[PDB]
Design a protein around this ligand. Structure first.
Ligand code: GX4
Ligand code: GX4
Lengths: 412, 412
């Protein structure tokens, strides 16, 4: 048998704000965080907009000297991680430090640091490569730097499962706690891919919306005029905690993480199967894991990337798993507002799934002006919908056909 | 409840050979795979050598058309994965595809591809970035492409924990099986960081041996004249199987994986503690997890990177964990011969640890001419040592204070 896992701390950088409550405010108001990218010549690029983190002050978290050593994606992860730990009220001690671990991931990692260090390599030669290039860029340095700053001696690792990173990180952090390997984990993901390599790289695959004239309308999941995902930066971190540990210190419990599902499509490198067979298996795995019937699910935070084939696979998958319950659950894409934070998408959308539970409100899918063929589910078009939510799912579907599902329940 | 996990398949590319048996023959003969690098011009670099994979033919495994789109670290990962699965005799069917997953990781991932595409972006512009840049370079696409080629629909993920990646990948994959999330897992890691950014980045940090004039003598773990690690390329993959599943199909069992430890040092971004504290916590977690008396340990495959601080930390950790039994077990570093395969180090060394059990021989630490102050254990200097090995331990340490231990024993 198995220990129960609750959420006692949440932290976030998003295109909607510098913390969870500002972000959540934007979500329920249907605000877009998408805009032309600044301080950067995108003249030769077919996409010139995305979700940037606006006004981020790393010196709230690190000295200028330590921040200079770390890629933006690491700064973002640390910000969310430090917010999440502070939000939890947890005190690290000699008595508990070996029971507190970290799993903060990234899908794409340190492109900004790779670009600057390439610029030096090609222009001047290898002698201008930063000494901090490697430890300042490697994906596991959010877990590493967090563990060093706070003295965490529990499981220390990082997932990289592309657009599924955040979902997987949180789920496998929850298994560490459930199976007694840890009492507390900081888990989630961070990403800064709004640079030339990210816009360029995704641009070259024609994966990105090129709607440069109306950036706020670019991300339009399940809408017949969608033309690919919007690329976005940020981080999400949760403090996961064994229930008895949380109750003993009198922790505030936002929700219970009751279920985690993983699956592989074994289909295509970037395209999901049309019927979403992988996403269906993954969601069924998560519900079986939670001991729940599909009928008990009230809210789904969709992957909902605004890609032609991705959005319609998730409709198929939901209809397949949920049968005659499929129209009764509400399902929304907060990527309609935030765009796609890649590896951090699962982390911030777990937070939105938890806050949907706390506030009894389904976040909207904005821009859903003209649902596409078969997109006839309750996709919460345009406006937030207050409703009953006991159980919320969060899905992520990534490149290589890697799937993640998290199941959260109201706690009382 | 918690199930037992055995090794039924292994695969490898190393600087010593294009498979396991060829690589193992090199190990037992004390051969170095380190040589001046030929595939690029390093006259600007303070390190001009490493452990290259020599004569690798990707068209033994994949079509030239798909090979061309993948970073060498993905090619190496798939080659080792394919060997391991063939070596297992396992047949993937509709009855078991959902119960077979893959966790093949990398420390640095697609550095070559990112460099070349970064060169295209700066010299030419974003219209010259490869459409395959992202799916051909990101760390999770070994697990991704393996699942697509073999039809594996089980848990599909990747770790990135720097020089610990391979040990963590194998360990967490065993936990998947132990806890019933899968019956089979292909796990390990791959690395190809020998490009300008790689040798330049580690060179900027002064982390690498600069013994350019005698590369086969550069990697000299615990030797007083060591001057940093030797960068090497390749792949290790293992087929992990639930015991009863392996028994049921009459699989050949190399060994049982009885123990896994993880621990963060929470010490420093890149330097390990002098006293071996994080390593010690990790090995103790691993030994308790295996339900072992530490005097049961016969053979330790050390991290053994040929850094001043790393090498002596490990002696301290082993003396602290094993007390007087530290003087009875044999410890060696195959990095004396392979060099440091970073995220793939834990995977090839897990295979060497298993083969030490099959053949009852401790691999040598070559180039240990003048052991350093306090390096007074049986380090298997110069020559392989036939000896009783019931229990073998494999240690990895990484940047971020991230530690891993695997415990294998002979299976009757
Ligand atoms: O984003 C990508 C691929 C699309 C290109 N990368 C994968 C490997 N990771 C990496 C880590 C450390 C380092 F030194 C360099 C690269 C993250 C960057
Ligand atoms: O000169 C410095 C400042 C500490 C003073 N370095 C920063 C990068 N560090 C590092 C070590 C190994 C390595 F492979 C990569 C990076 C340590 C060296």
């Amino acid at each position: 048998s198995r220990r129960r896992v609750v959420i006692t701390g949440m932290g976030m950088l998003s295109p909607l704000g510098l913390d969870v409550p500002s972000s959540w405010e934007g979500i329920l108001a249907g605000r877009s965080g998408i805009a032309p990218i600044e301080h950067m010549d995108l003249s030769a690029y077919s996409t010139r907009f995305g979700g940037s983190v606006k006004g981020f002050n790393v010196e709230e978290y690190l000295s200028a000297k330590e921040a200079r050593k770390l890629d933006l994606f690491i700064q973002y992860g640390l910000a969310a991680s430090f917010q999440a730990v502070r939000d939890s009220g947890l005190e690290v001690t000699d008595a508990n430090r070996e029971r507190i671990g970290v799993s903060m991931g990234s899908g794409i990692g340190g492109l900004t640091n790779i670009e600057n260090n390439c610029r030096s390599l090609f222009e001047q030669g290898p002698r201008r490569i930063s000494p901090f290039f490697v430890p300042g860029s490697i994906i596991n340095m959010v877990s590493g730097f967090l563990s060093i700053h706070l003295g965490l001696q529990g499981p220390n690792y990082a997932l990289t499962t592309a657009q599924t990173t955040g979902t997987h990180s949180i789920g496998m952090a929850a298994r560490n706690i459930a199976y007694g390997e840890a009492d507390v984990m900081v888990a989630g993901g961070s990403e800064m891919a709004a640079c030339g390599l990210g816009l360029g790289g995704f641009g070259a695959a024609r994966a990105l919306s090129t709607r440069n004239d109306e950036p706020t309308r670019a991300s339009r999941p399940w809408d017949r005029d969608r033309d690919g995902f919007v690329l976005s930066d940020g981080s999400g971190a949760l403090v996961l905690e064994e229930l008895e540990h949380a109750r003993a210190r009198g922790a505030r419990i936002y929700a219970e993480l009751v279920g985690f599902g993983m699956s592989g499509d074994a289909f295509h490198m970037t395209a999901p199967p049309e019927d979403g067979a992988g996403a269906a298996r993954c969601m069924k795995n998560a519900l079986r894991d939670a001991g729940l019937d599909p009928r008990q699910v009230d809210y789904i935070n969709a992957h909902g990337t605004s890609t032609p084939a991705g959005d319609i696979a998730e409709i198929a998958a939901v209809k397949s798993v949920f049968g005659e319950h499929a129209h009764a659950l509400s399902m929304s894409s907060t990527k309609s507002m935030t765009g796609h934070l890649l590896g951090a998408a699962g982390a911030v959308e777990a937070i939105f799934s938890v806050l949907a539970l706390r506030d009894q409100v389904a976040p909207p899918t904005i821009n859903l002006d003209n649902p596409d063929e078969g997109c006839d589910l309750d996709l919460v078009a345009h406006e937030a919908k207050p409703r009953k939510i006991d159980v919320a799912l969060s899905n992520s579907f990534g490149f290589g056909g890697t799937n993640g599902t998290l199941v959260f329940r109201r706690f009382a």
